[PDB]
């Protein structure tokens, strides 16, 4: 009968946490930012269009030099583009064509990809033989890989469909730390600017904050009503934004430990597939299933623009490190670069 | 205009594009099929008669087919099922016989039929284990299905010699059960092709080929704007 008393402990703890959170809140973010000037209309238009993929595109990632990017598509290819001249630098065939993510190392020497095969593959781009080879294959997950991010040339963090996140050591190919606590498929993760913490969004309408060293979960964030498909920190690393299937985006805080603002509109009824901030964090970008990409004023929740140029759903987007451009991938097998 | 290294880079890009064209020629010439079913379906027998993913390749009349069997994931499908939005067809195998296995198969079919990303994929339906059904019924579905009593074998039914009318009535009852939700929201966007198979059957591949042929005409009739 200890189940009942543990259940009571859990519910009273939830009650006291809710009480503390409500006590810590008196004024809304919109009420404070009611006086700052708006950003006006934001009219961005296509500057480049990268063709060459055969099927839909799941993942996309910018290099640290803000010029090279890598894209993954379900046909089994992995293409590295030169965004300034629309030149294909590399074309990498994959063993399994069901790829669902890709990442590009900050140093620029490696790329990673994974998917339904439950394997994260590391590719070497600077070999003396002149081609691109597979360096390590990371096994141990029992579900599809959904995201992966590099910390340096030797460490990578992956989130899989087995409700766990893991920290790998590329040299020895072993899991050093395993993060547990989610109850649904983990769909995406984002690394902090200082690379000390990271957040993950799962299919239980909750987000968690992890510590890389001790493998411990610091805070748990709730407020969404459905699955979470995207997440990204604010530039200063004290907030993050999530996009869910309930047709809303939300901004959370790490120090006040609660919700701050909701970005929703009455005529939007499709889910969100990707989010990203601008360099100064004033603009929040989101990709939807209705083929568009809205641009939100992060401090006022007013919509500011639309990037309507795609024929199918938008599956990935990202913003360069210098903030000069934004790229969007889509299920029609085209990338567009807006500015 | 351009430097020498820029010209060489453009040449490399064009070579890569040539390779991509050579690969596209192969990619467009193959058909991808997703094999799916319940745990006790008996899909091992079907695949024998013809890690994360188990793949099988075959060709008929020098036309190549890929058949995928996703069996290395958990039991939650709403997230990884979206990858297969561009396959030509979905092969659905059910064991036509404890808990009610038929109802969960029907619910899975209903969910697949109405998904916003799978509203265009046709379904090929295989009703397996007819011998099991015959030997079981000639000796409980009326309990699992009260509306079974007031059922009449269809006029266009084609019985097989040496088969009791009880068994064929059960078979066409199950087929009509699937077809009722098949045609509830079809809209001509996609269709369902039912078939009867057994443990010993060698021509299921021919049936799959014919159904894929039919699917390929309706997309070209709609592609070239004749319908």
């Amino acid at each position: 009968s200890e189940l009942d008393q543990l259940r009571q402990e859990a519910e009273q703890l939830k009650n006291q946490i809710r009480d503390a959170r409500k006590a810590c809140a008196d004024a809304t973010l919109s009420q404070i930012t009611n006086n700052i000037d708006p950003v006006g209309r934001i009219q961005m238009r296509t500057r480049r269009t990268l063709r060459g993929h055969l099927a839909k595109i799941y993942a996309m990632h910018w290099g640290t030099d803000s010029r090279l990017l890598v894209s993954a598509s379900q046909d089994g290819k992995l293409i590295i583009w030169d965004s300034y001249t629309t030149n294909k630098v590399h074309a990498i065939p994959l063993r399994s064509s069901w790829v669902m993510t890709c990442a590009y190392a900050p140093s620029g020497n490696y790329v990673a990809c994974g998917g339904l095969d439950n394997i994260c593959s590391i590719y070497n781009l600077k070999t003396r033989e002149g081609n691109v080879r597979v360096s390590r294959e990371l096994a141990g997950h029992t579900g599809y890989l959904s995201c992966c991010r590099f910390l340096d040339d030797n460490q990578i963090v992956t989130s899989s469909g087995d409700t766990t996140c893991a920290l790998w050591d590329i040299e020895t190919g072993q899991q050093t730390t395993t993060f547990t606590g989610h109850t649904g498929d983990v769909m995406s993760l984002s690394l902090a600017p200082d690379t000390r913490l990271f957040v993950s969004g799962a299919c239980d309408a909750s987000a968690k904050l992890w510590d890389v060293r001790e493998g411990m979960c610091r805070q748990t964030f709730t407020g969404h009503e459905s699955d979470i498909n995207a997440i990204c920190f604010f530039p200063n690393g004290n907030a993050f934004a999530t996009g869910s299937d309930d047709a809303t985006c939300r901004l959370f805080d790490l120090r006040a430990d609660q919700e701050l603002m909701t970005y929703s509109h009455d005529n939007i009824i499709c889910g969100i597939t990707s989010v990203s901030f601008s360099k100064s964090g004033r603009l929040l970008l989101a990709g939807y299933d209705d083929f568009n990409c809205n641009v939100w004023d992060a401090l006022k929740a007013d919509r500011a623009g639309v990037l309507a140029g795609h024929d199918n759903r938008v599956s990935c987007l990202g913003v360069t490190d210098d903030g000069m451009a934004v790229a969007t991938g889509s299920w029609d097998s085209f990338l567009k670069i807006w500015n | 205009t351009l430097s020498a290294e820029d010209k060489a880079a453009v040449e490399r890009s064009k070579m890569i594009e040539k390779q991509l064209q050579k690969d596209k020629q192969v990619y467009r010439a193959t058909h991808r099929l997703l094999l799916l079913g319940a745990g006790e379906s008996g899909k091992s027998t079907i695949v024998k008669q013809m890690s994360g993913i188990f793949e099988t390749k075959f060709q008929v009349d020098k036309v190549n087919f890929h058949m995928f069997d996703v069996g290395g994931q958990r039991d939650e499908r709403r997230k990884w099922i979206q990858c297969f939005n561009d396959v030509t067809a979905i092969i659905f195998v059910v064991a036509s016989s404890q808990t009610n296995r038929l109802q969960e198969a029907l619910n899975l079919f209903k969910s697949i039929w109405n998904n916003r990303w799978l509203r265009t994929i046709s379904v090929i339906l295989f009703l397996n284990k007819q011998d099991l059904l015959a030997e079981k019924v000639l000796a409980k579905i009326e309990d699992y299905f009260p509306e079974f009593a007031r059922y009449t074998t269809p006029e266009d039914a084609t019985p097989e010699p040496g088969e009791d009318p009880r068994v064929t009535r059960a078979k066409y009852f199950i087929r009509d059960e699937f077809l009722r939700i098949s045609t509830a929201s079809g809209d001509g966007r996609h269709y369902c092709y039912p078939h009867f198979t057994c443990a010993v059957d060698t021509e299921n591949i021919r049936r799959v080929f014919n159904d894929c042929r039919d699917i390929i005409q309706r997309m070209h009739l709609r592609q070239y704007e004749l319908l």
Partner: single-chain antibody, 236 residues
Framework: DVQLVESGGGLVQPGGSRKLSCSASGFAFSSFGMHWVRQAPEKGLEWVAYISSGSGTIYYADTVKGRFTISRDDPKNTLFLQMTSLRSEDTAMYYC??????????????WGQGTTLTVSSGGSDIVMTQATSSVPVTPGLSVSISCRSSKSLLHSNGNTYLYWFLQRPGQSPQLLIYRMSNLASGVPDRFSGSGSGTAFTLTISRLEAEDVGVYYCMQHLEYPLTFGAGTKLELK
């Protein structure tokens, strides 16, 4: 390991013909452009010919235009140079050089060993100038090498196409710096490249006995590619 071995040299009479072959083993040969560079008996380097990947582009120097033919055979990893009507100015030792071009690559990174060819006795090109020819030096201190070009090498896209090579006594040339500021792979970091426009400078810090040889500057802005006279370092 990367290995370029070549053969076909020897003695020949004026006006004859001969074929040179370069055998490549250890890398993806079909993805690399290939160059031929020759070494006069007591002179500097000289560019001869170039064939791109896929044989879609070929260039020749003026001195050998119309008499030399370059070709490659990808399936068996071999590079050919066909020479006709040999003269007395062609007596040299010929090198086989690989090169790959994409954003961020390092061309002219690996060189062959060379084959000696001896022949019995019978206007708008960019001029690269290395004024100094010999510098006496002891190990320990810093050295500076200056190269100057007739035309400015700074392209509009922001790249400056200048390369540096070092040739130890009795060995093949080895790449040091590419595009004025980039260190080659597997090269000590005490080297540094600098310059602007038409004046260039390479600096050696903490010189040792291993840095004794001849240094050449090359431009890659336009074909034909032209080298410098070469500057020699003598060990005290």
């Amino acid at each position: 390991d990367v290995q370029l071995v070549e053969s076909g040299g020897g003695l020949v009479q004026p006006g004859g013909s001969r074929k040179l072959s370069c055998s490549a083993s250890g890398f993806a040969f079909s993805s690399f452009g290939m160059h031929w560079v020759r070494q006069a008996p007591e002179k500097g380097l000289e560019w001869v010919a170039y064939i791109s990947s896929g044989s879609g582009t070929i260039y020749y120097a003026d001195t050998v235009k119309g008499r030399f033919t370059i070709s490659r055979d990808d399936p068996k990893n071999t590079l050919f140079l066909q020479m006709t009507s040999l003269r007395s100015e062609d007596t040299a030792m010929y090198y086989c050089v690989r090169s790959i071009y994409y954003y961020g690559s390092s061309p002219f990174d690996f060189w062959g060993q060379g084959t000696t060819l001896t022949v019995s006795s019978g206007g708008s090109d960019i001029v690269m100038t290395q004024a100094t020819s010999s510098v006496p030096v002891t190990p320990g201190l810093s050295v500076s090498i200056s190269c100057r070009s007739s035309k400015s090498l700074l392209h509009s896209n922001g790249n400056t196409y200048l390369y540096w090579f070092l040739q130890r006594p009795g060995q093949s040339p080895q790449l040091l710096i590419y595009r004025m500021s980039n260190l080659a792979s597997g090269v000590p970091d005490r080297f540094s490249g600098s310059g602007s426009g038409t004046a260039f400078t390479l600096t050696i810090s903490r010189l040792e006995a291993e840095d004794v040889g001849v240094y050449y500057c090359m431009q890659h802005l336009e074909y034909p590619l032209t080298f410098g006279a070469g500057t020699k370092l003598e060990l005290k």
